[PDB]
Amino acid sequence: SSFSRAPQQWATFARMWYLLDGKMQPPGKLAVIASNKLQGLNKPVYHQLSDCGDHVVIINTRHIAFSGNKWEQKVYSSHTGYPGGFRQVTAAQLHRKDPVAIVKLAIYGMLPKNLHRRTMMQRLHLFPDEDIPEDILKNLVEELPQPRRVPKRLDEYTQEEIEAFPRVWTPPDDFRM
Amino acid sequence: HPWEPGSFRVGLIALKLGMMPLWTKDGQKHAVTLLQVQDCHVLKYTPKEDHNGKIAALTVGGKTVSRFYKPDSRLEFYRDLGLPPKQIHKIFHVTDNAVIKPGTPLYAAHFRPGQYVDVTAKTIGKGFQGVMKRWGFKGQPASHGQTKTHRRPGAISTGDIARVWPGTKMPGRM
Amino acid sequence: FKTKGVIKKRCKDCYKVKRRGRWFILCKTNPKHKQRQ
RNA sequence: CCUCAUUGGAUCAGGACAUCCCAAUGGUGUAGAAGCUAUUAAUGGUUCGUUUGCAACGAUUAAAGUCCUACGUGAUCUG
RNA sequence: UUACAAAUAAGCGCUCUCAACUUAAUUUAUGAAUAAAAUCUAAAUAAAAUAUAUACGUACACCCUCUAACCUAGAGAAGGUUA
Numbered sequence: 222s223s224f225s226r227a228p229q230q231w232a233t234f235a236r237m238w239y240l241l242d243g244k245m246q247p248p249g250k251l252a253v254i255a256s257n258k259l260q261g262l263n264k265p266v267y268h269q270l271s272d273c274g275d276h277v278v279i280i281n282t283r284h285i286a287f288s289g290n291k292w293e294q295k296v297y298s299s300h301t302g303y304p305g306g307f308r309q310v311t312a313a314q315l316h317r318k319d320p321v322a323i324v325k326l327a328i329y330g331m332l333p334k335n336l337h338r339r340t341m342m343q344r345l346h347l348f349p350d351e352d353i354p355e356d357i358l359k360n361l362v363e364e365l366p367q368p369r370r371v372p373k374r375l376d377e378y379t380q381e382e383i384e385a386f387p388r389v390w391t392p393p394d395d396f397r398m
Numbered sequence: 399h400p401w402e403p404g405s406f407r408v409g410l411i412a413l414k415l416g417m418m419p420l421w422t423k424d425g426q427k428h429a430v431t432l433l434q435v436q437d438c439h440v441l442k443y444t445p446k447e448d449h450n451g452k453i454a455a456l457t458v459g460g461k462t463v464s465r466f467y468k469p470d471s472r473l474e475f476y477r478d479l480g481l482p483p484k485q486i487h488k489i490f491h492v493t494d495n496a497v498i499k500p501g502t503p504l505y506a507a508h509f510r511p512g513q514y515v516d517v518t519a520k521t522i523g524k525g526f527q528g529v530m531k532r533w534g535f536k537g538q539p540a541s542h543g544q545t546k547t548h549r550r551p552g553a554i555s556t557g558d559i560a561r562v563w564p565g566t567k568m569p570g571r572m
Numbered sequence: 573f574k575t576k577g578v579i580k581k582r583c584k585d586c587y588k589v590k591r592r593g594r595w596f597i598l599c600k601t602n603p604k605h606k607q608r609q
Numbered sequence: 610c611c612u613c614a615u616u617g618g619a620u621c622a623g624g625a626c627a628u629c630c631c632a633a634u635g636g637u638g639u640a641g642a643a644g645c646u647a648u649u650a651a652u653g654g655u656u657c658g659u660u661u662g663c664a665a666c667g668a669u670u671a672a673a674g675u676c677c678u679a680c681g682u683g684a685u686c687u688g
Numbered sequence: 689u690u691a692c693a694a695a696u697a698a699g700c701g702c703u704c705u706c707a708a709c710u711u712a713a714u715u716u717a718u719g720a721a722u723a724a725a726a727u728c729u730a731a732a733u734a735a736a737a738u739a740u741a742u743a744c745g746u747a748c749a750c751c752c753u754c755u756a757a758c759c760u761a762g763a764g765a766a767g768g769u770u771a
């Protein structure tokens with residue numbers, strides 16, 4: 222309150238810069254978060270005619286995780302338009318060629334199938350590793366929680382924690398192990 | 399720098415003089431083409447980063463031309479380099495060890511007998527052509543009732559797809 | 573290797589394995605006994 | 610009591626794989642050489658004539674595949 | 689060689705054509721479930737192995753004066769050339 226008409230309008234409809242970390246995150250749960258921010262659906266002032274979307278920056282897209290055997294079972298298909306121009310490439314092969322492709326395609330499908338979707342994709346910035354340009358860092362406003370809880374490896378477990386967990390059974394001494 | 403394996407050095411721009419016969423000690427005759435290296439200088443250098451490739455780039459140019467019907471932009475480019483304007487520029491991919499300073503002339507001795515080479519140039523223009531001379535289509539018979547169809551393309555495509563595939567061979571500029 | 577719908581052992585020496593997503597009966601003594609599903 | 614009426618070719622071919630040749634393999638009553646059977650693979654290729662109205666042959670080839678596209682295709686042509 | 693009884697165009701003349709990161713059938717090596725001095729593994733692993741293909745290359749890359757003339761560039765426009 223007490224803002225002039227012009228600054229108040231500017232503050233309300235300003236676009237925000239967010240950061241997602243894709244380390245060990247499934248690409249489609251990142252898309253759910255990224256797609257929501259891009260459309261501006263996180264804002265109570267959201268309207269389909271208001272161009273109120275936000276920037277989303279995603280890092281570590283090289284280290285995404287697929288549940289099950291989706292790396293080998295999920296296939297991306299494209300056509301150049303010429304006879305003999307149909308290509309079907311598995312998720313693993315697409316990942317090797319382009320580290321950023323899988324996340325970008327997952328987000329693309331989630332956005333509304335209208336002309337504005339292509340503008341939204343301009344607001345999306347994907348980097349395969351943690352490296353970010355200097356300018357992009359300055360823009361960032363807020364980080365975002367990861368959608369998937371990352372299980373710890375055995376090495377990560379502390380020595381105290383191992384002791385706390387009980388020994389369900391004991392090996393007999395007459396065992397090679 | 400000295401040569402190391404995997405290096406790529408600069409190339410030259412030359413003018414095509416013509417052809418002549420040539421013979422080997424085995425008596426075989428080989429038709430050969432004569433290429434003249436003519437006012438070939440190194441013009442510009444980029445580093446690997448700016449060219450966006452893994453490898454760097456050198457721009458060479460040959461066959462000095464007049465200065466009288468050229469845009470001011472091209473003339474300024476050469477005035478900085480202190481050379482008379484050249485007919486054509488081309489880009490060569492050169493490794494870092496093989497970089498040569500701009501303004502450096504190049505000569506036919508840059509090549510030696512026994513090495514194999516690759517030549518790229520614009521082909522002779524044939525204008526707008528038909529389908530027989532552009533893609534070697536058989537065509538249709540001369541007589542026996544053929545009505546106004548001798549050198550024409552046959553059926554473009556199939557009836558089902560209800561369109562013409564992109565990349566279909568058609569009459570055009572050859 | 574015959575690709576058949578049902579895999580059945582044909583001799584004592586025949587043994588069964590699960591390789592590359594399929595069931596195999598492999599017999600060292602008699603290679604005729606080899607079957608894939 | 611009898612019955613009976615769309616399809617070739619030319620041009621350019623797109624695709625399926627249930628593979629004719631080329632390529633990688635299992636088995637054999639696989640000594641070698643020839644073969645037989647099955648898996649995998651759609652990669653490029655897959656001839657020229659004679660009598661023919663549907664076949665009938667000749668000479669070749671690594672092979673002269675089987676099918677789908679409204680005889681694929683007559684505002685491209687032809688019997 | 690055949691034409692234009694032209695300085696050109698053709699073939700019946702001449703030259704040049706290559707790399708495979710990524711697999712399937714199949715075959716090995718190490719080794720658990722499963723006391724083996726077993727087992728190629730929809731166990732964790734290490735390799736070899738069709739046709740495909742574009743990761744990797746070559747080609748392209750210039751912001752460009754134009755009265756006009758000329759051009760191995762061209763339907764027009766475009767493009768090249770101009771002590």
Ligand SMILES: [Mg+2]
Nearest residue numbers: 536537538539
């Ligand atoms: Mg003819």
Ligand SMILES: [Mg+2]
Nearest residue numbers: 544546547548
């Ligand atoms: Mg006529």
Ligand SMILES: [Mg+2]
Nearest residue numbers: 558559560561
């Ligand atoms: Mg259609």
Ligand SMILES: [Mg+2]
Nearest residue numbers: 304622623624
């Ligand atoms: Mg075809």
Ligand SMILES: [Mg+2]
Nearest residue numbers: 626628649650
């Ligand atoms: Mg098959």
Ligand SMILES: [Mg+2]
Nearest residue numbers: 557682683684
């Ligand atoms: Mg028609």
Ligand SMILES: [Mg+2]
Nearest residue numbers: 546550684685
């Ligand atoms: Mg017409």
Ligand SMILES: [Zn+2]
Nearest residue numbers: 583586599605
């Ligand atoms: Zn057996």
